[PDB]
Design goal:
The structure is cut from a larger assembly and holds 5 copies of chain A. Chain A has about 230 residues and is α+β, with helices and mostly antiparallel strands. Chain A is built from 2 helices and 12 strands, in the order ββββααββββββββ. A 6-stranded antiparallel β-barrel of chain A has the order 1-4-5-8-9-12. Chains in contact: A-B, A-C, A-D, A-E, B-E. The interface of A and C includes residues 158 and 166 of A. Chain B: Belongs to the InsP3 receptor family. Chain B: This is Inositol 1,4,5-trisphosphate-gated calcium channel ITPR3. Chain B: It is found in: Endoplasmic reticulum membrane; Cytoplasmic vesicle, Secretory vesicle membrane.
C-alpha cells in the first residue's frame, strides 16, 4: 500500500450504474466512455494503455481564456495577451515541476491527463451531454481550461478532508465549476457498441484508483512496462 | 406581583408597511416613557394633519401657481421655532425638563429603561425628518370605496406577511387562506386602466412586492402539487404589478437575480418586467441572455425563452443593436439543440408531416410554434440594416429551403409569413449586396406564389 | 449473515479473540495509535465484521437495534473507530 | 507513438466517411467533422502550429518525411482518393 | 378637483419641503452633538447628577449600553456610532437659517456655559471606552452597517496618528482574548474582497469596504509605530493572521498579477479603483517605513510577486487613463516610488536590491527618469510634480546601483 502522489500514472475503475474502466474512442474523438465488457480488475482490458491517466496539479488559465475571448471577438493588445498566455503556461509548467511528487490530500484540486492522447479531462457546464440531456458534457481538451479542475473527495466515511489519498481507494471526482460528480451513465453509444457514456450529474458513482506507475519510476532512462520498443 | 408583559415595540417609528431591587420604580418609569412615546406619536399625527389641511387650503384657493414660500413658512413654524407650536410642547421649559429626564434615565441600571431613554433622546432631535418621512408615507384617498380597498388590502398583506414569516408549519390550515388571499388580490388589483394605475401606485407605496418576493423565496420541496398553485398566483400578481408601470418594472428588476432559475413561470415574469422598457432592454447585461440561451440548450426547447428574447430586442419601437448582435452570436454558437432547422430532405419531410396536422391551427407550445418563433426571432435580429447578423443568419436558412417550404402546396400561413419576413429582413433589406437574391431564379418563384395567393384571396372573398 | 456477534460470559475461550487490520499506512507495524479506524477479523473463523440493516427489535414501534455478523470476505468500508474514553469519565 | 495513433484514427474516420459517401447520404455534422479532420491532417503533415493562419495557404520549409511515411503506410492517401472519387461517382 | 392634479401637487410640495428642511435637520443633529458634548449643563452645579455628568459617567454608560443593545437595537447602535463619529468631527455651517436654528436651540437648552480639540475629544472617548466598544463590536457583530460604523469610528479616533489611541489599541489587542477573532474577521473580509475582485475582473461592497480598512490599518501604523507594525504581521496567539501579505495579494489581484505586470497594467486600472490602489500603496508604505525589516522582507519575497506589480507601476504607463487624467497617474507613480524607497531605506544587504532589479531593469529605469524630467509640461493644474517623481526615481536608482554595475554606468551623465 502507498499514498497517491502528483505525477503517478493511475487507472480509474468505475463502480456505479455500470462497472468498468474509463477509456477513450481515439485521438480524433473527444468522448470519454466506459466499456464493462472490456475487462475488470482481475482481467484488465487488453488495450490497457488507453485507460491510463496522470495526476497533475492545478493550472491557471486566466490569461489563456482572455486571449481566447480576444480571438473570438488591437494588434498590440493581442500581442500582449499572447505573451501573457505564454508566460502563464511557462509558470504553470514550472509550478508542476516544482510540486512534482507531492502527496495528494482529500479536498485538493487535480487534473487527469489522458496520456495516449496527451489531453486533460474537462467538464463543460455550458453544454449538455450528447445522450443524457439532463447531465453536463465531459470531453478531452489538449490545452485544458478551468473545467479540468476536479476535487478528489472521499467516498468512504472513514476518510476525511485533509487525509492523504491511499492507492486502491474509492473516491469521487467532482468538477469545481460544474459541481456535479462524474457519472458513468447506462446510455450506450449508437456508433460504438458496448461503450457507455461518462457525464457530469448527481449520482453515487465511485472511482477506484489503481496504481500503474510511480512518479519516481516514471523517468525516461529506464525500461518500463508499457513502453513501445523495437527489437 | 409583577407581570413584565411587553407588547409590540413602543419606541418604533410608525410606518405604512408595519432582578433589580427597585424593579417597581424601573417599570413605572418605563411605562411613563411608553406613554410619552404614544403622546409624541399623537403629536406627529396632528402635525401631519395640519400639513394636509394647509395643503388642501392652498389647493382649493389656487384651483377653485402655489405659494410654496408660504407653505414652507407654515411648515417650518410648527417645529418649536416660534410660539405658534408652543402648546404642542410636552414641557413648560422648552423641552429642558424632558431632555434632563431622558439624560438622567439613561444613567440607570435597567437596560430596557436606558434603551427607551436613548430612543426618545434620538427622536427628540429628529422631529422634522420623522415628520417629512411620515408625510411622504401618507396616502390620500377620495372615496370611501378607496378607503375600504386600502383597509382590505392592508389586512390581507399583513396576514400573508405573518404567514410567510412563519412558513414552517405548511412547507393544512395555512394553504386555503394563502390561496384565497392571493386570488382575491389578483382579482381586485386589475380593473380598467385608471383603477389599474391607482392600484399599482398604492401597492408600490405599501410594498406588496416585498412580501410577494418573500413568498417566492421560501424553501420548498421539489414536488408539492398544492403550493404550486400558490406560486402560480404569486407570479400572476407580479405580472399584473408591472403592466405599464416602468417604476414597478425597475423595482422588480432590482431583484432580477431571484427570477434567474430554471422555470417557465419566471420567464413570463421576466418578459413582463422587460416589456416595452427601453431603459432596461438597452442596458440588459450579458448574464441574462446567457442564462436564457443555456436554458434553451440544456433544459429544453420552449417558446417562453424565445418570447423573452424577442421582446428584449425591440422596446418602444426602437431596436437594440447590442441585443440583436449578442442574441444572434449566442444562438449560432449552439446548434441542433437550440437553433433547429429543417433543410435536409428528411427534415423537410418530417416538417411537412407534422404541419399537415396543423391544418386547423398551429397547436400552442408545439415544435412548429417553436420553429416559427425561432424564425421570427432571427428575422427580428436583422431588422436594423445590420451587416453581421444578416450575413450570419443567411447561412442558417438558405434561400433554397425558404422557397421549397413556401411554394409547397401543404404550407400554412404562419410558416409562410415567417419565411417571407426572414427573406425580406435578412436577404432583401440589407446594406450589402447578395449574389443569390438577384443572380438566381428563386425570388421569382416566390413572386409567382404571391400572385397565386392574391388570386386565392380574391376567390375566397368572392365566396 | 453466516455468523452473528454475541456476548459470552467467559473470555477465556478461543472464540473471543479478534485481530485488527489498519485502514491506512502504518509505521512498519509500530504501536497502534489512539483514535484509529480498524477492521476487525475473527481469529477462529477468519471472518471480517459487517453491520446489517436487519433490526433486532422489529416488534417495537421504532426499532433502533441493528444486527451485526461476519463474512469470509473483507469490505474496505466496514471500519470501526476506537474512540478513547477519559479515565475521569 | 501518438502520431501513429492519430494517423490510424484519421484513416479509420476517413474510411467511414468514404463508406457513407458511397452509400449516398452524409449528415451535416458528419461533413463538418470530416472537414475538421481534413484541416487537422493538413496541419499535421505541414508540421506547423495552428496560429489561425489560413489552412489552404501554408508554406512548409522542410517537409516531414516521418509524417509523409505515416500517411502513406496508414493509407490516408487512399482515403483521400476515395473521398475525391465517391461524391462524383449524382451526389 | 382632479386626482392626478392633486397627486402632482402633493409630490411637488413634498419635494419642496424635503429640499427646504434639510439644513434644519443638520442643525438639530449638531445641537444633539453639542448636548452630548456638554450634558452636565442641564443640571444644577451642586447636583450629584451634574457631578456624574461632568465626570463623564453619561458617556461611559452610553458606550457600555451600546454593546449590550447592539444585539437587538441595531438601528440604535448605528445611530449612536454615527453620533460619536460626528462628535469626533470638526464644526460645519448649515447656512444662515441653520445657524439661527442652532443658536436658538443652544440658547434654549444649554443656557449656561482644531487639531488639539480633536485630539482631546479622541482622548476623552478612549478614556470612556470608545476603543474597546469598537473592538468588541467589530469582533462580535454580524451586521455590515454596524461593522462599517465601527470602522469609521475607529478611523475618526485614530485620525492624526494619535499615539495615545494607538497605544490603547495595542494594549487592548494584547490583553483581550478576542484579538484572535478580530484578526480572523479582518483576514476573512480581506480574502473575500480579493475573491470578489478576481471574480469581477460598479464596485461591490466587499471591495468598497477595503478602503476604510486600509485607512484604519494605515492610521494604526502611522508615525512609525514599530509595535503595531510588527503586530499586524505576527501576533502572540495560537493562530496568526498576517495582514501585510493579504494587502500585497489584494494589490496584485487588483493590478492584474502577472498579466498586469507584463505590460497590461493599464487595462486593470481605471478611474474607479485608482483611489483604492493609491490607498493600498500608502498602507504598504506605512507598513514598510520606520523602517520595518520584517515587513520589507515579507513584501519583497512574497510568493505573489507583488514587487513586480510595484515596479510595473513605475515602468509602464497606463495607456487609457493617462490620456485624459494624468494627475492620478502621477500620484500613483509617486506612491509607488515612495513605497520602493520605504522598502529600500536602510537595507545594507543585497537580496531586496537584486529582487527589485529583476523586474526594474536599468535602461528602462533611466528612460523613465528622463521622461519624468522632460514631462514637466504636464504640471499644469497638478499637485504632483513629474520632475519630483523623476528625482525620487533617480534616488531609488542610485540606491540600487550599489549592487548593479550597469545601472551605475548608465546613471553617470554625459
Amino acid at each position: 500500500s502507498s499514498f497517491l502522489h502528483i505525477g503517478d500514472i493511475v487507472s480509474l475503475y468505475a463502480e456505479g450504474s455500470v462497472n468498468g474502466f474509463i477509456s477513450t474512442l481515439g485521438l480524433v474523438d473527444d468522448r470519454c466512455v466506459v466499456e464493462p465488457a472490456a475487462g475488470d480488475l482481475d482481467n484488465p482490458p487488453k488495450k490497457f494503455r488507453d485507460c491510463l491517466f496522470k495526476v497533475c496539479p492545478m493550472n491557471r488559465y486566466s490569461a489563456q481564456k482572455q486571449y481566447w475571448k480576444a480571438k473570438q471577438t488591437d494588434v498590440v493588445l493581442l500581442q500582449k495577451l499572447q505573451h501573457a498566455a505564454q508566460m502563464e503556461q511557462k509558470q504553470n509548467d514550472t509550478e508542476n515541476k516544482k510540486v512534482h511528487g507531492d502527496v495528494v490530500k482529500y479536498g485538493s484540486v487535480i487534473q487527469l491527463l489522458h496520456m495516449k492522447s496527451n489531453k486533460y479531462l474537462t467538464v463543460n457546464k455550458r453544454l449538455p451531454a450528447l445522450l443524457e440531456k439532463n447531465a453536463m458534457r465531459v470531453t478531452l481538451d489538449a490545452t485544458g481550461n478551468e473545467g479540468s479542475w476536479l476535487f478528489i473527495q472521499p467516498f468512504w466515511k472513514l476518510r476525511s478532508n485533509g487525509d492523504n489519498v491511499v492507492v486502491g481507494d474509492k473516491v469521487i471526482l467532482n468538477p469545481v465549476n460544474a459541481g456535479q460528480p462524474l457519472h458513468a451513465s447506462n446510455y450506450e453509444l449508437s456508433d460504438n457498441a458496448g461503450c457507455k457514456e461518462v457525464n457530469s450529474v448527481n449520482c453515487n458513482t465511485s472511482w477506484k484508483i489503481n496504481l500503474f506507475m510511480q512518479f519516481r519510476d516514471h523517468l525516461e532512462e529506464v525500461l518500463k512496462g508499457g513502453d513501445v520498443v523495437r527489437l | 406581583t409583577m407581570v413584565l408583559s411587553r407588547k409590540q415595540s413602543v419606541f418604533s417609528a410608525p410606518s405604512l408597511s408595519a432582578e433589580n431591587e427597585d424593579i417597581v420604580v424601573m417599570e413605572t418609569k418605563l411605562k411613563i416613557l411608553e406613554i410619552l412615546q404614544f403622546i409624541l406619536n399623537v403629536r406627529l399625527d396632528y402635525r401631519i394633519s395640519y400639513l394636509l389641511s394647509v395643503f388642501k387650503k392652498e389647493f382649493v384657493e389656487v384651483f377653485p401657481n402655489m405659494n410654496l414660500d408660504r407653505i414652507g413658512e407654515q411648515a417650518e413654524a410648527m417645529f418649536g421655532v416660534g410660539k405658534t407650536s408652543s402648546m404642542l410642547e410636552v414641557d413648560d421649559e422648552g423641552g429642558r425638563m424632558f431632555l434632563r429626564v431622558l439624560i438622567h434615565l439613561t444613567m440607570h441600571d435597567y437596560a430596557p429603561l436606558v434603551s427607551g431613554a436613548l430612543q426618545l433622546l434620538f427622536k427628540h432631535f429628529s422631529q422634522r425628518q420623522e415628520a417629512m418621512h411620515t408625510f411622504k408615507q401618507v396616502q390620500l384617498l377620495i372615496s370611501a370605496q378607496d378607503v375600504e380597498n386600502y383597509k382590505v388590502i392592508k389586512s390581507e398583506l399583513d396576514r400573508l406577511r405573518t404567514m410567510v414569516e412563519k412558513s414552517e408549519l405548511w412547507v393544512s390550515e395555512n394553504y386555503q387562506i394563502v390561496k384565497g388571499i392571493l386570488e382575491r388580490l389578483n382579482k381586485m388589483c386589475g380593473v380598467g386602466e385608471q383603477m389599474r394605475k391607482k392600484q399599482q401606485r398604492l401597492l408600490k407605496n405599501m410594498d406588496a412586492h416585498k412580501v410577494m418576493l418573500d413568498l417566492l423565496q421560501i424553501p420548498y420541496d421539489k414536488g408539492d402539487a398544492k403550493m404550486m398553485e400558490i406560486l402560480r398566483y404569486t407570479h400572476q400578481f407580479l405580472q399584473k404589478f408591472c403592466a405599464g408601470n416602468p417604476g414597478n418594472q425597475a423595482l422588480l428588476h432590482k431583484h432580477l437575480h431571484l427570477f434567474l432559475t430554471p422555470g417557465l413561470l419566471e420567464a413570463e415574469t421576466m418578459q413582463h418586467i422587460f416589456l416595452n422598457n427601453y431603459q432596461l432592454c438597452s442596458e440588459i447585461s450579458e448574464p441574462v441572455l446567457q442564462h436564457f440561451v443555456h436554458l434553451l440548450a440544456t433544459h429544453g426547447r420552449h417558446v417562453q425563452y424565445l418570447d423573452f428574447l424577442h421582446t428584449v430586442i425591440k422596446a418602444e419601437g426602437k431596436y437594440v443593436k447590442k441585443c440583436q448582435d449578442m442574441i444572434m452570436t449566442e444562438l449560432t454558437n449552439a446548434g441542433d439543440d437550440v437553433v433547429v432547422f429543417y433543410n435536409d430532405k428528411a427534415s423537410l419531410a418530417h416538417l411537412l408531416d407534422m404541419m399537415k396536422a396543423a391544418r386547423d391551427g398551429v397547436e400552442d407550445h408545439s415544435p412548429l410554434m417553436y420553429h416559427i418563433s425561432l424564425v421570427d426571432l432571427l428575422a427580428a435580429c436583422a431588422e436594423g440594416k445590420n451587416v453581421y447578423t444578416e450575413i450570419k443568419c443567411t447561412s442558417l436558412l438558405p434561400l433554397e429551403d425558404v422557397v421549397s417550404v413556401v411554394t409547397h402546396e401543404d404550407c400554412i400561413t404562419e410558416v409562410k409569413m415567417a419565411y417571407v419576413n426572414f427573406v425580406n429582413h435578412c436577404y432583401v433589406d440589407t446594406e450589402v449586396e447578395m449574389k443569390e437574391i438577384y443572380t438566381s431564379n428563386h425570388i421569382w418563384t416566390l413572386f409567382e406564389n404571391f400572385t397565386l395567393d392574391m388570386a386565392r384571396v380574391c376567390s375566397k372573398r368572392e365566396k | 449473515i453466516k455468523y452473528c456477534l454475541v456476548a459470552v460470559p467467559h473470555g477465556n475461550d478461543i472464540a473471543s479473540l479478534f485481530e485488527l487490520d489498519p485502514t491506512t499506512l502504518q509505521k512498519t507495524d509500530s504501536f497502534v495509535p489512539r483514535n484509529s479506524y480498524v477492521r476487525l477479523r475473527h481469529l477462529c473463523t477468519n471472518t471480517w465484521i459487517q453491520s446489517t440493516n436487519v433490526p433486532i427489535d422489529i416488534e417495537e414501534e421504532r426499532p433502533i437495534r441493528l444486527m451485526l455478523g461476519t463474512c469470509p470476505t473483507k469490505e474496505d468500508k466496514e471500519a470501526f473507530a476506537i474512540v478513547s474514553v477519559p479515565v475521569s469519565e | 507513438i501518438r502520431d501513429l495513433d492519430f494517423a490510424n484514427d484519421a484513416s479509420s474516420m476517413l474510411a467511414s466517411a468514404v463508406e457513407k459517401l458511397n452509400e449516398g447520404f452524409i449528415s451535416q455534422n458528419d461533413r463538418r467533422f470530416v472537414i475538421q479532420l481534413l484541416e487537422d491532417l493538413v496541419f499535421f503533415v505541414s508540421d506547423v502550429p495552428n496560429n489561425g493562419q489560413n489552412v489552404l495557404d501554408i508554406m512548409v520549409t522542410k517537409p516531414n518525411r516521418e509524417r509523409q511515411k505515416l500517411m502513406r503506410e496508414q493509407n490516408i492517401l487512399k482515403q483521400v482518393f476515395g473521398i475525391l472519387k465517391a461524391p462524383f461517382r449524382p451526389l | 378637483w382632479d386626482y392626478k392634479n392633486i397627486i402632482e401637487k402633493l409630490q411637488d410640495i413634498i419635494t419642496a419641503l424635503e429640499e427646504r428642511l434639510k439644513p434644519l435637520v443638520q442643525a438639530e443633529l449638531s445641537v444633539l452633538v453639542d448636548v452630548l458634548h456638554w450634558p452636565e449643563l442641564l443640571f444644577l452645579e451642586g447636583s450629584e447628577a451634574y457631578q456624574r455628568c461632568e465626570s463623564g459617567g453619561f458617556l461611559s454608560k452610553l458606550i457600555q449600553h451600546t454593546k449590550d443593545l447592539m444585539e437587538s437595537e441595531e438601528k440604535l447602535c448605528i445611530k449612536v456610532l454615527r453620533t460619536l463619529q460626528q462628535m469626533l468631527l470638526k464644526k460645519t455651517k448649515y447656512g444662515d437659517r441653520g445657524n439661527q436654528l442652532r443658536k436658538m436651540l443652544l440658547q434654549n437648552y444649554l443656557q449656561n456655559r482644531d487639531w488639539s480639540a480633536i485630539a482631546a475629544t479622541q482622548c476623552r472617548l478612549d478614556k470612556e471606552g470608545a476603543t474597546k466598544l469598537v473592538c468588541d463590536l467589530i469582533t462580535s457583530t454580524k451586521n455590515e452597517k454596524i461593522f462599517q460604523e465601527s470602522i469609521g469610528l475607529a478611523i475618526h479616533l485614530l485620525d492624526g496618528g494619535n499615539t495615545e489611541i494607538q497605544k490603547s489599541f495595542h494594549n487592548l489587542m494584547m490583553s483581550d482574548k478576542k484579538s484572535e477573532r478580530f484578526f480572523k474577521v479582518l483576514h476573512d473580509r480581506m480574502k473575500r474582497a480579493q475573491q470578489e475582485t478576481k471574480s469581477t475582473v460598479e464596485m461591490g461592497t466587499s471591495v468598497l469596504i477595503m478602503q476604510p480598512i486600509l485607512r484604519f490599518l494605515q492610521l494604526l501604523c502611522e508615525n512609525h509605530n514599530r509595535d503595531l507594525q510588527n503586530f499586524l504581521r505576527c501576533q502572540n496567539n495560537k493562530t496568526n493572521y498576517n495582514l501585510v501579505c493579504e494587502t500585497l495579494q489584494f494589490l496584485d489581484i487588483m493590478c492584474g498579477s502577472t498579466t498586469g505586470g507584463l505590460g497590461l497594467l493599464g487595462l486593470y486600472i481605471n478611474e474607479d479603483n485608482v483611489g483604492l490602489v493609491i490607498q493600498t500603496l500608502e498602507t504598504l508604505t506605512e507598513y514598510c517605513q520606520g523602517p520595518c525589516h520584517e515587513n520589507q522582507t515579507c513584501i519583497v519575497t512574497h510568493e505573489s510577486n507583488g514587487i513586480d506589480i510595484i515596479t510595473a507601476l513605475i515602468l509602464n504607463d497606463i495607456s487609457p487613463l493617462c490620456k485624459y487624467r494624468m494627475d492620478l497617474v502621477l500620484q500613483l507613480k509617486d506612491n509607488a516610488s515612495k513605497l520602493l524607497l520605504a522598502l529600500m531605506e536602510s537595507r545594507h544587504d543585497s537580496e531586496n536590491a537584486e529582487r527589485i532589479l529583476i523586474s526594474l531593469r536599468p535602461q528602462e529605469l533611466v528612460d523613465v527618469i528622463k521622461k519624468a524630467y522632460l514631462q514637466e509640461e504636464e504640471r499644469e493644474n497638478s499637485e504632483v510634480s513629474p520632475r519630483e517623481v523623476g528625482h525620487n526615481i533617480y534616488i531609488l536608482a542610485l540606491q540600487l546601483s550599489r549592487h548593479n554595475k550597469q545601472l551605475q554606468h548608465l546613471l553617470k551623465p554625459v
